[PDB]
Amino acid sequence: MDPFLIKLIGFAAATCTTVAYAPQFIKVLKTRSARDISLGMFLVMVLGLALWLIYGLLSGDAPLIASNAVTMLLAGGILVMKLRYG
Amino acid sequence: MDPFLIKLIGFAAATCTTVAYAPQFIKVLKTRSARDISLGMFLVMVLGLALWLIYGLLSGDAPLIASNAVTMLLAGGILVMKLRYG
């Protein structure tokens, strides 16, 4: 019945990107982005993440669940990007 | 036995981000990134994606499998980023 042990193994491997992804998100902010960038692209990505949470639960996978939580917190860099506007 | 129908549903939803993510990748290139950016972060992300393919197959999920294939092709934007070097 979809053993939880599988989720743990996936997280362990995904940890490399997840751990590296978090700091990488901040670096993107210093990438000197312009306001003329379509923020709509980022908004869509967030929508997929929200849905991925449901799918992740159905599979009992941790990487998708943990990624969604981590992304939400790290995503906070949205305010920084929005600063470029106006 | 992990019905394939589940993978199809996940892809349909993930299609929003997957479809939007592809064009978003190109836009990142025009983000005026600097060579002083740690490319190592991107390298690690790729490693996780390669492993995710195996995990994705184990779950029979299409979003992870399709994402890996799409990312590999779209990732090609690596050469553009490498151009900043030197």
**How many whole angstroms separate alpha carbon B77 and alpha carbon B25?**
8
Give the CA distances from residue B2 to residues A63, A75, B6, B7, in Å, rounded to whole numbers and listed in that order. 18, 32, 8, 9
**How many whole angstroms separate alpha carbon B55 and alpha carbon A61?**
10
CATH number of the structural domain spanning residue A31 = 1.20.1280.290
Would the CB atoms of A61 and B59 count as touching at under 8 Å? yes
User: How many CB pairs (< 8 A) connect A and B?
Assistant: 93
Would the CB atoms of A48 and B23 count as touching at under 8 Å? no
Segments forming the whole domain that contains residue B36: 4-83
Structural domain tally of chain B?
1
Give the CA distances from residue A86 to residues A34, A81, A82, B17, B77, in Å, rounded to whole numbers and listed in that order. 11, 11, 9, 27, 29
Method by which this entry was solved: NMR
Distance from CA of residue B5 to its chain's centroid? 23
Give the CA distances from residue A80 to residues A28, A85, B20, in Å, rounded to whole numbers and listed in that order. 10, 10, 21
